[PDB]
Amino acid sequence: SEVVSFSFTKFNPNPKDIILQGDALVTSKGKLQLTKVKDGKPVDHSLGRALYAAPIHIWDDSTDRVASFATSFSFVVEAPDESKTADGIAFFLAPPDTQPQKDGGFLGLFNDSNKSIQTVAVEFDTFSNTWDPSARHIGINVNSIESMKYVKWGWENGKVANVYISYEASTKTLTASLTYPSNATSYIVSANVDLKSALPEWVRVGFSATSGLSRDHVETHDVLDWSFTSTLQA
């Protein structure tokens, strides 16, 4: 494929363009609620993922070409307690048949299987596990729950976060930024990532999130909108 694009200003309650996995659902107001909410309150031990229906052609073995892509999405992570939060939300790419992996700190993306899984993620990590830096962080993750690069992230409870992720194929640069319009505060991180080596030719793209494994480490992970475009020169 050469060019694929799609833009949701909000999500449809029974989405056919979006493959919902685990606890993910679209609320009737059109928020993509990745992790469970009960009586308006986030629940623990939740794992939800959402992928776009069409696979994306990110590289081609015949032509040796790599896709470029850009995506925008806004998301909210709201926790009943500012200091106890887990586990986070991520935008990711994985093989098209990708299924939910471990919950909790593995973010539904990775596992501890000793079989290195193919998934490239931009995580917004709200809990410091063994493999994390100390502070909440935006991480670029290449086939590991351990980020290859991260920036410390001043998570704002319940505030809309605007994210813009792009991948420039000609330089192998993956760049992720987050901005909180509420107080015009922003964070960015970039990495040199070889998508040909990390991922298969075709992938599915989307989001994954998990709530903490305890009652006092719960938060929501809602996506409010999403735009994506990818071009493969071919």
Sites of contact with Ca ion (CB under 5 A): 105, 125, 127, 129, 132
Half-sphere exposure of 174 (CA within 13 A, CB side): 23
Does position 87 bind Mn ion by CB under 5 A?
no
Does position 125 bind Mn ion by CB under 5 A?
yes
User: What whole-number distance in Å separates Cα of residue 108 and Cα of residue 162?
Assistant: 22
Is 81 within any annotated ligand binding site? no
What is the pattern of x (binds Mn ion, CB under 5 A) and - over residues 133-152? ------x-------------
Answer whether 118's CB lies under 8 Å from 94's CB: yes
Strands 222-231, 32-33: pairing kind = antiparallel
**Interface with a second copy (CB under 8 A), residue from 81, 135, 154, 234:** 234
User: Any idea what the Cα angle at residue 215 is, between residues 212 and 221, rounded to 5°?
Assistant: 45
By C-beta, is 125 or 222 nearer to Mn ion? 125
Contacts with a second copy by CB under 8 A lie at 1-10, 12-13, 15-17, 52-55, 57, 60, 62, 96, 149, 162, 164, 166, 168, 171-173, 175, 177, 179, 181-182, 184-192, 202, 234
Binding site for Ca(2+), residues? 125, 129, 132
